[PDB]
Symmetry: D2
Subunit: 335 residues, 4 copies
């Protein structure tokens, strides 16, 4: 058996959304800042992303992260989020899995009450309170980048079909479009996952074509990579169901940590939330994250908030991914 | 890290369609015959299938197989095909993967012109000619179960939409419905993969409600588990594009071996194919299989054929698939 | 990367003495009875034994076991013991290792109070009582082949040096040469391990040359493959320290199992033990086994006993062992 | 299954002498310089070394290296040798292993004529020319620290037995005590490996007690951690047989790399070698290295040489090493 290249990685799941965490396939990535490290990857080893996020090794949806050398102070190691599309600037389910697994494997040397983990992440730092119940990780409270309301509703226009009106956009690590499922008239359920998909991505794009997308700091992002559609929850707990469309038409199985932290900055600046006050966000599956607002913060030029998301991940296998250099799909394909 | 259970299994890929080959999770499966080993599994360890085929470990589509102690004469080891749906009686892409990887890992001590592998399978035996080019596996000619035309056009009736007419059915390890893409007016392409998927499974069901499905021997099958839609290829090589829908609404990335070994028996009995005479089947991807008729044979009560399917697989990972017994999805979910 | 072959195996350790258990690197081995499997191996795939037990993948000492398809009734799977030297007919630390790991990995589904495991082995059957503490394997009570006192002392003659006298020989799966460390004047300790080693294998040999070695039943063993030297323990618990020399001049880091089961018979028939009554055996490391006599039995011609040995193993790694066909030592070497 | 920590590491062998290369069990180790890393390890995670290099996982002899983050310029990654004893400051077998595998696995993207690798190491930098035969790694020319003749013969005194005279000492990364096998009267063979072992360490020690051991530069080594014994080769090729004793009484299955780079400096400065001119060194196994002198250099105070050692490693298995926290020998033991 010829192979050439051999990638080691840990398959987790945070609330059903898969994270595949890379470990040993490369010993070294320079980058410098954790946005530079991401750019390096993208413009150099995209072939690793595609190979592992696409078929045949992965699938549409499917999601993963690289565990780096940090460079940074305070932060243990550094995280680069990747997907079937590209490289997400920030990801809650990801952050969760990463941390869960770091401790689990004992890459971190675990502390009993809780374990604090400071990770890099392309967009600012992140900290994860990792509850451990003597023996196990019980769950994880990640505290996120400054999230905020961006552009108050704003008119939308959707060619297919009708050309509707109101919807809000907000940051939370990336830029989410938050639109209500009544607004376009979708049922945030298994039924329509694909119509949701094509609806989401079609909005994302024609939103990305003709808008002002900009962070008044970090000055790189300037994109609406994400579409959150939400509606009343058919679970008793949780304040809403959301589904989150992203990366070349994929859909999150979790409520999307970055999507909840964004949504929390677009309550609050609305009134319907006070600092703390348990938020719970329902996904499109039957799974739920325990969000809440922590503090106030005016980012660069306009008011904002720093929110705390609280999920939990499980280990679902170890891989030695390999590529037979004959395999004419050795760097993977889509559909 | 607590884990309780630990499954060893090699990811492969025949022509795009994944085959996840199980190796070392269990050291015993009694069954007896390779239909009695499939029942055992079905009724007992189904938890294995679901866990591996279904998220978060696998996906909708996705496919695999258990390498088993043989019992049988001639045959080396014994195969059991499993899928997002259930336990396919026979599968080419799988038999290909299973052979490729048996040799490639040196479970089979490789012979240099070609290696002959006799595998069990739920429906009859199968022999793989394995072409090895000093070092590597170059490709695989699998010679399939007796295929044959079964019924002939016959009544159709599709509620959504219109209620059309002609279409054929035939056996090639499993019972295929072979209906032209003009017949229901679908384009066998990426575009519509999903409408094809819901179309396929709806026909497969309402066809299985009101028909005569029966193999005159083996006397267990009696089902139309599969829907082959075909049309003129938009690849210069290959006689037709086919797309195969099966198991709980999933689609084969390959042309389907059993689908091609079926569709060969329902030419020939048609005139448009002489014994030998290269058939090439284009999948729904861009991939192709080199099929061709080998010999004549009347099965039990009616005339038939024994076809040869020729493809090729690649290794794409080694896994220690583990279940955290805290992982509430530890046996996996659908959508 | 280029490898041809790829063995799966799990590294354990039973009271320090390593047991490497083989899993996935073959799906079949015919043999028939768990002596005819051992002969098949010995006289066909010795190149597995040497490759794993010898350098550069194993070492002097080192020990391992093959998990097989059973064939037999009652018995789950089947075990084949192998060492630097050859294939050991029965081993306690092996049987322990094998059982602990079977359950732990979930190749056996675990039963809560205890799990019973019936394993084949090249000398009879063996049953392991697997104590599981809700979650974990606590330890293991293996119940062992009819042990007995064979040949009352008998004179030894040792060239280097002097030429001494008394020492006894027994059976407990294999034939043990029990001799007191005061008899040859050795200190069963770290200090002299190697003089013990060479003293042992010289006795074993020149004993094997000029004696009557015979089991009245099974009629294949007829060998003294083992040398047990014992003295007053410098651990408070345990009735003695023993060290066990075997297979091409290696030494057992555990008290040995088969060696303890042997020695128990040759108390008892001595008067210094009553059915039950805790025996504890100290190794040549600081590690201990909990042995005790279960019931009487006169084997074929002469009186005997059936003993129980109690220990506990730990997992120390997972291996995808591979052989680069260019690696001139692919099948390994000794010194 | 329950496991505290999970270490990814690749087993190799350079000319029979094992090198176990760590990969993924950690993502970080601060240190700073590839000495200050080695110290950090030595005075913090000596529980890694001992676990892996000692039983039950490793053995007496046995050896392995850590692949690090570099910090340094030019150099890809960084290397930390480790052995049954401590942490070798430089080692040929290692630097070879480490390079062979880095390319072979595709951690380095391979260049066809030869790949150049710059690795850190505790003692300076090293560069490896890695010869790749289109597909494979054929062999590896590592260029080594300025070697030299230190102290002309000097009288030894050996208590067991007689008390002999002449023997030289040199540097090649570490300080080698080169003495002829006629000098003490030992046959550098299998027969006496253990008398050689105990002779070596006893010399190494009583040499370290009463001598002047000093590098004029780097100012941290000041030790004779190595004992080379050499004699006429009973292999046609190779100028001499040497066996190399080090680290807590272990023996080197290769000729030693550092031990050859040393010995080369103490020919040459002797007149029996001209710049280039193939030197070949035989090991205490039948195995050889292709050494030669590259260029002159007077280190700090006294004359010297920079040599080039040429060998070739092979992968022998992939490990997920795991420690059951119950495993009382979790951190491993000696004898
Ligand atoms: O889980 C999340 O935070 C996420 C990021 C992108 C989609 N979901
Ligand atoms: O290629 C095949 O054999 C197959 C079976 C089911 C789907 N494809």
């Amino acid at each position: 058996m010829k192979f050439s290249k051999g990638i080691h990685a840990i398959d987790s799941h945070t609330m059903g959304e898969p994270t595949r965490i890379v470990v040993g396939g490369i010993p070294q990535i320079n980058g410098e800042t954790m946005a530079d490290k991401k750019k390096y990857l993208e413009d150099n080893l995209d072939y690793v992303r595609t190979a592992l996020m696409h078929e045949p090794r992965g699938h549409n949806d499917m999601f993963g992260s690289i565990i780096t050398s940090s460079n940074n102070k305070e932060a243990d190691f550094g995280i680069i989020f990747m997907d079937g599309g590209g490289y997400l600037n920030m990801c809650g389910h990801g952050s969760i899995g990463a941390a869960t697994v770091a401790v689990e494997t004992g890459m971190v040397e675990m502390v009993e009450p809780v374990t604090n983990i400071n990770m890099e992440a392309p967009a600012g730092l992140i900290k994860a309170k990792v509850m451990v119940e003597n023996e196990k990780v019980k769950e994880v409270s990640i505290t996120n980048v400054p999230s905020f309301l961006y552009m108050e509703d704003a008119k939308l226009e959707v060619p297919s079909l009708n050309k509707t009106i109101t919807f809000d956009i907000s940051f939370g690590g990336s830029f989410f479009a938050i639109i209500h499922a009544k607004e376009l008239g979708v049922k945030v359920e298994t039924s329509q996952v694909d119509v949701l998909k094509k609806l989401g991505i079609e909005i994302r794009d024609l939103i990305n074509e003709k808008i002002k997308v900009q962070h008044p700091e970090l000055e790189h992002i300037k994109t609406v990579d994400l579409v959150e559609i939400y509606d009343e929850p058919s679970n008793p707990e949780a304040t809403y169901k959301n589904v989150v469309i992203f990366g070349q038409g994929q859909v999150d199985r979790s409520p999307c940590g970055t999507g909840t932290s964004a949504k929390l900055a677009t309550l609050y600046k609305k009134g319907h939330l006070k600092i703390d006050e348990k938020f719970v966000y329902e996904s499109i599956t039957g799974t739920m994250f325990k969000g809440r607002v922590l503090e106030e913060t005016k980012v660069g030029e306009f008011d904002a908030i720093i929110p705390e998301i609280t999920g939990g991940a499980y280990i679902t296998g170890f891989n030695h991914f390999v590529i037979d250099p004959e395999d004419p799909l050795k760097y993977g394909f889509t559909v």
